[PDB]
Each structure stands twice: as structure tokens, then as C-alpha cells.
């Protein structure tokens, strides 16, 4: 059981305090990075604190349900994982949850309104309640994710709203780490292979040709992990693309010959399309977005002026090697 | 109150609870390890928590001392501290004690000090 | 959005939607408590004492626990007994196979931080390691007594679940 | 307990090498023809050319030991586990032990030369 | 449970004929200090936390430079 | 006093230090820290007794140790990256670049021979043979051979010390230094009839001592005064000589009427034993003197800009240059680390495999009791990489590979514990004598005393606070007077 | 720069090289007073020179040869 995790054994962190990771690297062992993650409960960051958690570093988990946070303490030693509860509203708890973090990110990003919150809530508005708070603390290796096509322009209010905490995030407290991942898979996805995985439907815009390279989330995660610890990461924006630009009818197929099934399409044109989206709101569990059509008509808007994996020697996989795996208990 | 949390941020607790006991706030060992140390140690899992609730209790080196140091008419002292009312065998078991340097004598067991006279 | 707003373990219901949503929570999280059942898993030292439960001295059924050996219908899991590195996966699939709004207990001191087999070679050292468990039984013969006060402390926590208000996003 | 289970054979000393050799070979043969069961059996992600170059390898480990005996309780342990893969008898977590190294890519800073295992004092 | 005092909490699961309040004093075992009672707090925030006693095994050396 | 509790503890035997015998002991370690040291039994070295300060050392041991490396700032120090140390070490040498006799490697009193062995390779590959010890007047030759290991070491045995007859002190406190030789010489006086003559300070022994004079001149007087009939006389006597005598710089004059008188008298001189006996008040400088850790005299001469410390503490202003790169390498915080630029926590004698060699000349592994604590680590293995990042490539890796390198040095070190004689008795004396002859003129000065106090020297009996307390009450009190 | 070798202190195979530091140091210091010298025995080895030059880097000779003279001539080739 030896430190895959860092590159040595003494560091002492950016703000100044000295970090021993004594024993041998496993489940049992102390690394001494005080992490925190927001979100964490949510599909990327499950992945995250696992690996993060692996070597045990300390991390500081804010949760929000009391239900959902509980399948994340198995990933932690005594120590390792702890809890606390907090809104982003209250900005005491925010405070609270980052008194010792040495290290902390924030995957907060919901791809529909609430009753309660807004795109122009929870991604500009609270990305700056908390990262105030970092440059109170003077908290080492700030990272803050966007989203993939995270620009200034109005046609997704979500991607209208991501750049802005963008600019935020690079106004205060400026140091602060951006990356933004490509479309992301994974075994129970949010919205990309588990909507494709069944679907009485299968319906959307643009017959089926918006581009991107999805990455698996665990070298998403791997990733990240290996951002964490080092040097020459600072103030640096992230771009993490796939190995090779698909199609959506490409990857449809790609499915659905693995399942051997007839995937429905219906690709309906975009008035009636919205409508239906419109009235899905009222209900508590989550549908598919009135803004989640806007994105259809979007794709991959890679930034050349960024840093791949290859920059922290990495290489994801490729999503042709993955589909027998994935949606394999649908066969 | 304030102390450093390692990175210059202070955490702030109230007095009453940068004690080593309701009764001392001062150490007792050389490796007491006081609360000054041990909420700059980990506060990750005392925040959102409660500083009433925890046992502080009651140390012992300042109710020993307040106790009257009793008097031997002759020479040996006996220390058991057991009760007359248990009927059974309690206390400390049944050493003996010289006092006879200046001063009294607590004996190593309950630390009820004696003296000759 | 508010900068100051109260905990959820803090807050009061005001708004006559909040009584709304706090009695029907109430109802929900009720019939939660009353109706309880978990699955069969003891395999030990600690299963006995789990049939102890059934026994018709600290009765079980006036408390709605009902043990439906079948773990789709089952609410909760109690692990019980040792917990050795051959049985491992199994405990993972069966923890698999129920339904979501469950929980898992540790009755027995085996079942949390290895007990009195800590330094064995071939066991898992507490069931921490394999399923996320949300209250401890402590005892080796962990007390029916102490059983049952785990199962009112569970359903204390299930007293406070929140499933209905977290809607309003509290 | 008169009868045995399906596989398993009653356990006998070959007084020869070749007999050994005979038997060890039968004994790959074997492995290689239930290979594409177990990855029907045991769900694996990966594919069956990597199993049968495990299963090769695995042997290369043990292509020169000298002795008879000691090829003799070695030949009766890779009879075992034989018996245990043709059956449900592992589970897929205990059939995933043979493949550490396959299913991670080890990790940032795996240690080279002198100085990375220096600087993590040998891990 | 255990919300009850220990001297009748024995009592309850019929440890002694003769409850607290019947008891003579000289079975009172006699303290110095005042009682405070804390029942149980699992999960309220004033749950138990744990940490070691005592300080850490070898301590440090403070940097003090000497200019020659 | 109450710390642990004998079936707790983990049992390691191991060599003592901070002694000149370097007696065979054994650590009582609970895992972390240190609990005691009981000395185990052997019977030419120690005869089953320990040094007072060997005892309580361990104090010192788990209370002021580097447990990180600190860079200066400027009279301020911060903690580090290990290899921002390291590289801030490899930068500064880019700045300054000793080539040649401008690299300062100076070892200590408590340091490994394995470890010095990677500080001369280091050194010597780097091109500077700028390899002093610790002691004033060590920034030249001790002033006798390095050569001829007699010249050096113990020639008579330990177990020859009930066969001596009639010998006499120099310069030194054998009370002091290696208090188990005082035990020897007190056995010896009273089981045999015996002669002890003192030249020097005027110590209080156990026994009875004769005193002679506090000058080379009057010790000149003392020689070929009625003792050159004695030690011819006598069946097996010895001389003995104390290591403070290095410090004078008329040591070798001081050597010269001592080197003549063994020639002389063929009592002293004769085949199975030497009369010759030197001590040092380390554990390592006699096995430094087996490595080869002498400067040259041209060596001798340059100021240089780059400092080596390991572990060293009693280096002072005057012996380091003013922008000098002193980067300290030790375990604990001493007058050493004060000055540094760059310190390096290494171990102690507890942590590592250590191998050291006494005055006898016995070398005897040192079993690690435990790891190294918090960030410190061996001293070799620090050399290697702080070779690395220079251009010097060290041959090595391993501890095995470090052992057939230490048997190139001297295969007597790799063969442990086992006392040789020396065939070279009157060659080595002659060639004693032929270096220092005539050139160094001996002055008047008075014989002081080596060390200042016994409980108060080689950076753990002043990291120890128990020896401090030690100190304050063992000094002419009331309580530690006799009449 | 520096030399050094290595004798068994038992009368095998090492007294020629015996003789050799018996005699030849009282020359070999003075026609060498830069380099220097140093002797140390092991109650059996090969008798062997090791010699380190100016850059750290070490040459050697193993010496099963017959008299001082002989020692000499591999000493000298050692050298240079
Ligand atoms: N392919 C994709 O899905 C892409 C996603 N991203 C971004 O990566 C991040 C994580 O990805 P993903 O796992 O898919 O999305 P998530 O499921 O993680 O998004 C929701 C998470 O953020 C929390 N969250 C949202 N709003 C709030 C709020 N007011 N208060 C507290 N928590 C809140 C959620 O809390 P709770 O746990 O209670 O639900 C949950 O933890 C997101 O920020 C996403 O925008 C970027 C590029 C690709
Ligand atoms: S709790 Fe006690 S009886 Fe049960 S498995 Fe553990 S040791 Fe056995
Ligand atoms: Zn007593």
C-alpha cells in the first residue's frame, strides 16, 4: 500500500502549514490534506471524494439531504469523511465549512430552476458567497468546475450563467483554478446514457448531430485528484476533452447495437417541443429541462488555449471501449 | 480564545471551555496535551457541534488538595480509604505510610496526605 | 437569496404551507416508524439474541418489527454476528437487491471495528468497510434492551428524515 | 460423503516428471478451454485473450522450478483453483484478485529511480 | 432509555427493593462536586466527540537562527 | 517513572553512543518513542555496567528533534519541501561553486560511520578533500598518523586492563571520559597492586592517583624522572592518553616525548601487546579515523564557502566563514542548527542501522528500534540524493551495496566486532614520531580540563532537560559535597 | 587523492606486502607527501590496493606477487 496519491511524502501547503503524511498509503494511513467538497453527494463527486478519501485525506463533506449523504462515508477511515449541514443561503455555514479546509471544490451546478433557485442563483450568486469566504481564509488550491461551451452569450441561460461564474471566480479571490470537463459518462449518468439507456420517447432537436467527446467521469475524477496536490495548476483554465469528437446518432447507435434493441426516435422540432418541457416544472422529481433544449442545438466549443490531460500524464478512454460495460443490465 | 488554525485564521471558542477541567484550568502532565492544543488539533469534527455537551470531569488535583490532612499519633500510618458502611472489600488496599520527614505524606494510592504528630 | 437563512435542524414551520408539509411528513415518516421491517442477516453469536427479540419477552411485534427474510421487502438490514472476508460479497449484493429508502444497523461488537476478531486474518474489520451503517448496537451479547433502544433510536432519526419538506429545499 | 463433486479428482503423486508434465499440460488445456465461461460466469469488464494471457503467464512463473514434489503440490494447488473457477465456488470479487494491475492504471508518481522512492521514503 | 438517574435506573430494571428516595444516606455515595446529568445526545450536535488525551510523542524544535 | 511497563515494551540490542567504549545495550522501546536503555551483558566491554549519562539520554531523544526541513529566510527559519531543501542546496551550489577546497564537511561526536563513508564519496567526487572533525585544532591532521590504526585506537585490550601493572593519565578525566574504564581501573587497583600516575588536571578519581605536573615540561621531567625505570620495570603496564591533548596544538611536540619513550623502553613496546592507548570522547571520530576524515594541509588552509554539517554542534562563529553555505544535517536543534541555512532532520542512533566503531576498536551493529520520526530520514540515504542533484553519481542505493563500499574503505569494519592486534607495534610508533619530529614547539600551557561538565555535551545532554537539572545540581552543592 | 591497502595480520600471503609497509612508507611518504596513505587488516582478505585520484574516481590491484620490489612494480603501474 504505497502513495499513488502524491508525488512525495513532506509538503507543506500554499498558505503555510506543514503537512506529514505519516504511514504507509492505504485506507488506515493519514495523508493530512483537510479537503472539502460542495456537493459532493452529486455523481461527480462521489467518484471524488472515493478517490479522495482513498489515501486518506481528511475531506469535509457539506451535504444538504440527510438521506443522500450517507453511501459516502464508506469510502473513508474514522476521520477521513465528516459531515455537516449547510445551505448555500446561510453564509455562516459556509464559513464554517472551510475553516480547515487546506484544499476545496465546488461541483454545485443543477441543470434546472427550482421554485427556489435560478441559473443566476446557484452559479454566479453562490459561487461568489463561498469563494468570498476562501479569500477570508487565504484557503490554498481553490478549484472552481464550469461546464463545457461556459461562455458569455445568451442562448442557454445555464451556459450564459457558467461563464459569468467564470469571470467571479477569476475576479475574487484571482488565483482561483478553472477547469471545465467535456459531456461526462458514467455507470448511472445524470442525463447522457441513463436517459439513453431507456427512454419511451427519445426525443430532441437538431436530428441528432451535436458534437462533443464524452470522457468517462472516473478519469475525470483521476484527474481532478492529480490537479490537487501539485504545483504549475494556478490560475489556469482547464479544458478536458475526450479522445475523438462524436455524433449523436453515432453514439445512439453505438448504444443500441449493444443492446440489440430498436432505440425509439421521434426528433420532433422545437415549438411543440418546448411546451410539453414547460409544464414538467410543477413536479418534484426532476425532468428533463425547458432549458436542457437549448443545449441540443449547441456543441463542443473547445478552447485551444488550455491544458489537457496530457498535461498531468493522463490518458482517458474511449467510449467504444466502455458500451459493453455500461448499460450492460439492459441486455 | 482566538488561537491559530494553522493557516493564520483563528477559531474562537469561549472560555469556559479552554479548560483542562471546571475546576483547573491549568495542565497537569507533561504530556497533557491542553485544549489550546486539541481544538488546534481537529476542529474538522467539532464544528456544527455543541461545546456544552461533552463530559469535562472534574479533575481530580484540585479536589484532592482541599482535603484536611489528617494527624498519627504515633508513627506508621495505615491508608485504605474504604468505606464502613460497604460491607465488602473496596478502597485501596491496605498500605502503610512513614511520616516522619517535614511535611505531610499523601499516600501514593488516594493521596489523603498524613502527618505525625 | 437570503445571506442569513436557519438551519434545517433548526427551523420552525410558519408558512401554512409549512404546516401542510410538516404534518403530511409527519404521516409519511409515521408509517415509516410503525411499519418496520428488516431482513433476516444473523448468522452468530449475534443472531441469537436477535431471535431474543422475537421472543415473547421483549416483543417485537408490538413494536411492528416483522422479519420479512426477503430482502426486496425489506426496509432496513440489521447486520449481526462476525463478519468474515469469505462472506463479504454477499453482504455487498444483498445490501444491493432494497429498495431505497433503507438503512443498515450494526447489532454487535463484531460488526463494527472487527470486535473481538479485530486482528484475525480472514475478516472484515466492522461492517464500515462493505455498507454505510447509521446506528451501532454495542454489546458482544448487544442487549435486547440495547437492541431495541438502537431500533428507537433509528426511528428517532426516521422521526427526523425530512423527505417532504427538503421539496421546499430547507 | 462417498461420491466426489464434478470436477474434482482423487489426488495422486506422479512418480515421474513426464507423468507431471503430462498432467500439467492436460491441466492448461483445461484452463484454456473454460476460459470463455468464466467471463460468461464471473461478468468480467474485459475480454478473454486477456484471461488466456494471464492463465500463460501464470505458468511462466512456475516453468522452472526443479523439483518433482514441490512442481507436485504446485500442480495440486492450480487443480484447486481450477475446481473453484469451473464452479460458482469464487465469487466475481474473489475471481477479480488475478487482475490487480489490469483494471487501474497505477497512478501519478509510481517510484523509478533513487529519488522517488527517496522522497516518499519507499512509500 | 437513559433519561432516567442511575440510582433509579437500577431501580427500573429492578435492581434493589428499596428505591433511591428510601435508601439510607449511608449508602449515598458522597461527592465533592455538583452533578450535572447529561441523558444521551446521539446525533444532536451535542453528540460525544473523541480525541487522544495527550499530545503528540516527540515535540518539535523551534527555529531559532543565530547570526555568527 | 511511570511511562511503561516491562511486557509492553519492544526489546532491541543495540551499541550505545556518546561513549567512547560504545557498550552493548538494549533499547526498551514502546513503538514511537524511546522508553530506556538496560545494558545488556557482554564481557570485554562493559562487564554488564553503563555510563550514568548513556543511561538517562533517551529524554533528549523524543523532545527537540528536526522533524522537517527548515531553509533560513534570513533570521528567520521556515519549513520546507524536501526537495525545495534539496534543491535550494543544489541552486546555492550553482551560485557559489566550490571547486575545489571551498567545501567544508565537518562530522560530529554521535555520527554514523555509514553515513561518512557517503559524506567522503560525496566530497571527493565533488573535488575537495575539505574534511575536517568537530574538534578545535581539527581543521588540520590530529597531529599523529591516520595511518597505523594504533596511532589511533585502544592497543592493549580492555580485558588487559586486570594484566596492567603500572600506567599513567594525560591530559584527560577517565572518570569522565568512559566512566566503564573507570570501573575497570577501580576493579583492577583493588584486586591487583598496582600504579597510577596523573599528569595534568587534577582530577578526583575513585581510587588513588599520583599526581606529576600541569606541563609537557614538567610530564618531560615526569618521564625521565623515575618512571622510565617503572614502565621498564613493570610486566604489562599501559599508557594512556586522552583525546583533549588534539586540541593543543603542541600535541605533536606533546606526541614527540611520549612517541620516543614508547620506542625506548621495549617493556612498553613488545610483541603481543602496545603500550600505546589513545581514547577519544566520541563513539565515531575513532571510526572517523578509520574512514579517512582528515584534512589535507593544503586543505588545511582555504576558507571556504560551503559548510557541511552532520551533526557537529560545537562549531562556533570563528570556525565558519561569513557568507559561508552551512546547510546542517542532524536530528535535533543544537548550537549546529542555530547557524544554518538549510537544516536536514536526520536520524538519531535509535532509528537507523547503524555501525559504529570505539576506542577498542570493535565495530557492532546498531538495530533500529524504530522508523524515523516525522520527516526525518537516514543519513546515507540523504547523501545520495543530495548527490543526485549535483553531478556526483554515488555507486549505490541499497545498505548491501553501502556494505561492500565500506568493506573497499576497511574490511575490518564489515567484519564486526572482533578485536585484531597489530603486527605493527614499533613501525607505527617510529612513523608516530618521524611526523610531528621537531617542528612543533610546546608552550606552557596548563592542562585543563577536556570538557566543561560531564552531563552537558554532544546535543542530547543539552536537548535533555533532565540533564539539565542533572547539571545544575552536580556542582560543589552542599548536598553533592563530602565533608 | 588518496591510497590505501589491505594486509591479513596472519603470516600468509601478505608478507611480502608485510614487509613492504615494514620498510617502503618511511619512501613512499616522502616521495609522495601530497597523497596519503593509511593501513588496515581484517584477520583474513586478498592483500589489495585501492587508490582514489582527483576526481573521486578509484582504481585497484589485487597483490599475489613475490617480494617488495614485486609489490613495488604494481604499485608504480597503479599509479599511473
Ligand atoms: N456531463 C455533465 O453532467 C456536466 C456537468 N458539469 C458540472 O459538474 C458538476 C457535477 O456534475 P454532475 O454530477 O453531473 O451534477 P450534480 O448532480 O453533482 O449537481 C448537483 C450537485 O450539486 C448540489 N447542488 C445543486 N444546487 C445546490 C444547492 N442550492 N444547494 C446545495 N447543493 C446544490 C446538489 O446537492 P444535492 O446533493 O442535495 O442534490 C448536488 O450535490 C456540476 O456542477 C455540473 O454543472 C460540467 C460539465 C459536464
Ligand atoms: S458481537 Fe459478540 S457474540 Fe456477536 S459476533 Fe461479535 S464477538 Fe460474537
Ligand atoms: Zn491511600
Known sequence: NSFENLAQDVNITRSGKTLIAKGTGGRSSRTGYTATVFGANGFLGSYLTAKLAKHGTTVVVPYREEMAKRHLKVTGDLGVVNFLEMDLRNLESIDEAVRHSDIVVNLIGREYETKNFNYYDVHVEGARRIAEAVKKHNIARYIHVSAFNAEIDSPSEFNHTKGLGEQVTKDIVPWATIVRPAPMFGREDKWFLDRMARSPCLVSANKFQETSNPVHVIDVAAALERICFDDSTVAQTFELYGPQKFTQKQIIDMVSETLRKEVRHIELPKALYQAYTKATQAIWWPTYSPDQVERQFLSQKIDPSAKTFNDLDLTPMELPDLMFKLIRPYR | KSIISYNGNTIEIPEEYTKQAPNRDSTWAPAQASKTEIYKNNMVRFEQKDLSKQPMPYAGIELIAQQPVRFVHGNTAVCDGANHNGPGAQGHPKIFINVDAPGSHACQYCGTRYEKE | ?170 | ?123 | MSQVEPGWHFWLGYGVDTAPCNTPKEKLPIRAYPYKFQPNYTGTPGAFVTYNTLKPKISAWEPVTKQR | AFRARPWELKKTESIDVMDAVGSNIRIDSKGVEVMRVIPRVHEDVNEEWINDKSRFACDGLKTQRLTTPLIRVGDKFVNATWDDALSTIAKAYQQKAPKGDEFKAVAGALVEVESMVALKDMTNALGSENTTTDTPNGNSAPAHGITFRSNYLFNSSIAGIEDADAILLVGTNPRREAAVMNARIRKAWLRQELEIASVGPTLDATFDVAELGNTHADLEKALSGEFGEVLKNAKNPLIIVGSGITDREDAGAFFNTIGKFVESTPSVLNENWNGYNVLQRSASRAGAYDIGFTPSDEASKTTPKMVWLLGADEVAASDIPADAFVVYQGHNGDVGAQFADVVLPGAAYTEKAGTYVNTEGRSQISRAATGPPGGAREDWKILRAVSEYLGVALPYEDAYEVRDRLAEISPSLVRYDLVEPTVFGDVAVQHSLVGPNGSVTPSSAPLTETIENFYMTDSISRSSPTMAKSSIAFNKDNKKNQA | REIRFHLCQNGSSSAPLRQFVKNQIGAFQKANPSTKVLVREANGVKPIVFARFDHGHESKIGLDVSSEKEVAERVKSLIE
Open chain 4, 1 to 123: 460423503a462417498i461420491i466426489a463433486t464434478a470436477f474434482a479428482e482423487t489426488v495422486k503423486f506422479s512418480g515421474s516428471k513426464q507423468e507431471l508434465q503430462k498432467r500439467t499440460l492436460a491441466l492448461y488445456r483445461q484452463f484454456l478451454r473454460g476460459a470463455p465461461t468464466f467471463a460468461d460466469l464471473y461478468e468480467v469488464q474485459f475480454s478473454i485473450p486477456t484471461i488466456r494471457t494471464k492463465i500463460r503467464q501464470e505458468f511462466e512463473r512456475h516453468r522452472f522450478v526443479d523439483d518433482l514434489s514441490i512442481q507436485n503440490v504446485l500442480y495440486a494447488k492450480g487443480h484447486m483453483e481450477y475446481q473453484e473457477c469451473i464452479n460458482f465456488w469464487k465469487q466475481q470479487a474473489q475471481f477479480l484478485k488475478y487482475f490487480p494491475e489490469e483494471d487501474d492504471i497505477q497512478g501519478r508518481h509510481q517510484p523509478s529511480n533513487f529519488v522517488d522512492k527517496f522522497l516518499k521514503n519507499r512509500a
Open chain 3, 1 to 170: 437569496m437570503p445571506t442569513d437563512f436557519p438551519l434545517p435542524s433548526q427551523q420552525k414551520p410558519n408558512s401554512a404551507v409549512d404546516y401542510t408539509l410538516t404534518t403530511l411528513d409527519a404521516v409519511a415518516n409515521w408509517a415509516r416508524q410503525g411499519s418496520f421491517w428488516p431482513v433476516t442477516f444473523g448468522l452468530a453469536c449475534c443472531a441469537v439474541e436477535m431471535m431474543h427479540v422475537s421472543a415473547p419477552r421483549y416483543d417485537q411485534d408490538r413494536l411492528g418489527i416483522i422479519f420479512r427474510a426477503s430482502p426486496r421487502q425489506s426496509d432496513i438490514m440489521i447486520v449481526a454476528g462476525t463478519l468474515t472476508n469469505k462472506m463479504a460479497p454477499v453482504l455487498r449484493q444483498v445490501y444491493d437487491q432494497m429498495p431505497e429508502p433503507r438503512w443498515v444497523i450494526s447489532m454487535g461488537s463484531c460488526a463494527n471495528g472487527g470486535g473481538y476478531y479485530h486482528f484475525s486474518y480472514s475478516v472484515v474489520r466492522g461492517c464500515d468497510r462493505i455498507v454505510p451503517v447509521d446506528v451501532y448496537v454495542p454489546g458482544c451479547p448487544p442487549t435486547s434492551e440495547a437492541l431495541m433502544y438502537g431500533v428507537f433510536q433509528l426511528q428517532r432519526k426516521m422521526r427526523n428524515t425530512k423527505i417532504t419538506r427538503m421539496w421546499y429545499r430547507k
